[PDB]
Amino acid sequence: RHMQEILDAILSGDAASADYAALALPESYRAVTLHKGEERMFDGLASRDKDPRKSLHLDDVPLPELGPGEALVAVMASSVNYNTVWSSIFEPVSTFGFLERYGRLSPLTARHDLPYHVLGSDLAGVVLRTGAGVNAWKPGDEVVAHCLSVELESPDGHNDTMMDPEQRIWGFETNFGGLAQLALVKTNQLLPKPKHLTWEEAASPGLVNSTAYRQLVSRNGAGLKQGDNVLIWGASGGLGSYATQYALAGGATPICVVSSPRKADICRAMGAEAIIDRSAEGYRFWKDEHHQDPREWKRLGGKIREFTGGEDVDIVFEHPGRETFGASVYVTRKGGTIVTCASTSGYMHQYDNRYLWMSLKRIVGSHFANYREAFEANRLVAKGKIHPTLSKVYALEETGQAALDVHHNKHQGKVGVLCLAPREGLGVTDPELRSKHLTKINAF
């Protein structure tokens, strides 16, 4: 296989950029895919019962044509994200509809409109080739990716690229995603691989880390400062765990909300101390399908003050949505910020505007990250200030099982997938920094 020659070049210690340029490209690559004819195979069934092992295929697919500003990457490792799982169960809607509609725009966008969809929105690996107009990345460069795909033809994004109107999430609204031996990305998705991490560790933070960085640290989100009290929902999950790391690393105090004592112990292993178990507390913020219970908002706030010395939180890091959002608005301090990047329990939010207007509060929407924020989030990983949260790794063959585990919230850490890497534990080229941070790296 030409593929074997690529992997052998990576696993050797020695290959120079010209050696990568001179390698023959394979004529196919192994990829985890969805099949267009199966869009409706889950109809009438409840979301919890839909089994991603039944919809995810392991196929050999041809390589796509490389366009300007793009790179073909040999993928050593990837990860499973929530968006991958939703895609794998054809929810909220099949991902093919957008591929087909976008494909009408031009021959280039038509490349993605195929009868199969290669999924995955994280990656760590090695650049094999770059298209026209690219100078900043070369064959051989070790990379991770962020998943924002923006064209930047509209002016709207030129003061923060999340404002670009023509926006796709790579591996979700794009083909040729990361759960595969090769991937196609824009070069403005590439970031330098942290050298103290293995391939699977380096591929794990991207999507959730960068989302939490924009949402909590950056000026485009909550603009955290040291001393702040931060209420963090779901603090042991992917997102919430990065939020907790950001709160502690920036000199602030996270108030961690979890659902079980073992999740509380995960929060403690990250160094949090104020942890609220909402299952043990029994918060019922909604008394109806339609009405909430302000008494319970107030009980949450009192609990928070037990940990803060009577202070209300400066920031709420929201993403459960409707179930918690009314409480989040109520408990926030006068002048404070509720920052939201998801609505996992429901997107129709309801809140008492008296608390927001009369106390000068603010609800700020945030959505993954611009290239600078993604670079900054990954830089904090590379400096050893933020650590990966891997809790289990699967082989590419096993991605269906991996997706299930995420679907059923089976692990608290990230679930990684080896793609071309033949085993865990490869890729580290800074052993000193890794030794410095080893216990934290392995905490999950």
Residues forming contacts to Cl ion in the complex (CB under 5 A) are 108-109, 312
Say how far apart CA 367 and CA 341 lie, in whole Å: 5
Measure the CA–CA gap between 39 and 24, rounded to whole angstroms.
36
| Residue 256, marked binder | no
Q: Which does 425 bind (CB under 5 to 8 A by kind): Cl ion, a second copy, none?
A: none
Q: How many CB atoms within 10 Å of residue 13?
A: 6
Distance in angstroms (rounded) separating the CA atoms of residues 327 and 188: 39
For CA atoms 82, 264, 200, 125, the dihedral sign is positive
Q: Is 368 annotated as a binding residue?
A: yes
- For Cl ion, the nearest residue by Cβ is 109
* Alpha carbon separation from 160 to 13, 156, 194, 375 (Å, rounded): 39, 8, 25, 14
Residue 35 counted as an annotated binding residue:
no
- 183 φ/ψ sector (left φ>0, alpha ψ -120 to 50, else beta): beta
58 versus 342: smaller Cβ distance to a second copy: 342
Is 250:217 a contact under the CB 8 Å cutoff? yes
- Asked if 73 and 130 count as a contact pair (C-beta separation under 8 A), the reply is no
In angstroms, give the least distance from the CB of 211 to a second copy.
10
Q: How far is the CB of 4 from a second copy (least distance, A)?
A: 32
Amino acid identity for residue 431 in this structure: P
Spatial neighbors of 379 by CB under 8 A, at least 6 apart, are none
Q: Shortest gap between Cβ of 245 and a second copy (angstroms)? A: 10
18's tokens: 């010209």
Indicate which of a second copy, Cl ion, none lies near residue 161 (CB less than 5 to 8 Å, by partner kind).
Answer: a second copy
Q: What is the smallest separation between the CB atom of 45 and a second copy, expressed in angstroms?
A: 24
Q: How far is the CB of 63 from a second copy (least distance, A)?
A: 19
| 367 marked among binding-site residues | yes
Would the annotation count 86 as a binding residue? yes
Q: How far is the CB of 9 from a second copy (least distance, A)?
A: 25
221 annotated ligand-binding residue? no
Nearer to a second copy, 14 or 289 (CB): 289
Query: Which of Cl ion, a second copy, none lies near 159, with the C-beta cut-off 5 to 8 A by kind?
Result: a second copy
Q: Judge whether 147 and 121 are in contact, CB under 8 Å.
A: yes
Which CB sits closer to a second copy, 116 or 250? 250
Task: State the minimum distance, in angstroms, from the CB of residue 58 to a second copy.
Answer: 32
Most distant CA pair in the chain: distance in Å?
Answer: 69
Q: Could you say which of a second copy, Cl ion, none residue 101 binds, taking C-beta under 5 to 8 angstroms by partner kind?
A: none
Of 116 and 307, which has the nearer Cβ to a second copy? Answer: 307
Considering the complex, what minimum distance in angstroms separates the CB of residue 309 from a second copy?
9
137 is in an annotated binding site: no
Helices 322-331 and 294-308, interaxial angle, to 10°? 60
DSSP 8-state secondary structure symbol assigned to residue 229: E
Measure the CA angle with vertex 255, ends 253 and 258; round to 5°: 145
**Nearest residue (CB) to a second copy, 46 versus 360:** 360
DSSP 214: I
> Contact at 8 Å (CB) between 368 and 375?
no
Consult the annotation and say whether 83 binds a ligand: yes
Residue type for position 187: T
Is it true that the peptide bond before 92 is cis, omega within 30 degrees of 0?
yes
Q: Which residue's entry shows tokens 């009192």?
A: 302
Helices (H), 103-205: 107-110, 199-203
C-beta of 313 vs 341, nearer to a second copy: 341
Q: Quick one: what does residue 334 bind among Cl ion, a second copy, none, with the CB cut-off 5 to 8 Å set by partner type?
A: a second copy
Q: Is 189 annotated as a binding residue?
A: no
Flag whether 412 is marked binding.
yes
Question: For a second copy, which is the closer residue by CB, 98 or 116?
Answer: 98
Q: Which does 162 bind (CB under 5 to 8 A by kind): Cl ion, a second copy, none?
A: a second copy
Q: How far is the CB of 191 from a second copy (least distance, A)?
A: 8
**Residue 371's binding partner, choosing from Cl ion, a second copy, none, with beta-carbon cut-off 5 to 8 A by kind?**
a second copy
Q: What burial letters (b/e) apply to 343-382, b meaning 16+ CB within 10 Å? A: bbeeeebebeeebbeeeebebbebebbbbebbbbbbebbb
Q: Binding site residues for NADP(+), as ranges?
A: 82, 86, 211, 238-239, 259, 263, 278, 323, 341, 344, 367-368, 409
Q: Binding site residues for NADPH, as ranges?
A: 82-83, 86, 211, 236, 238-239, 259, 263, 278, 319, 323, 341, 344, 367-368, 409, 411-412
Q: Binding site residues, as ranges?
A: 82-83, 86, 211, 236, 238-239, 259, 263, 278, 319, 323, 341, 344, 367-368, 409, 411-412
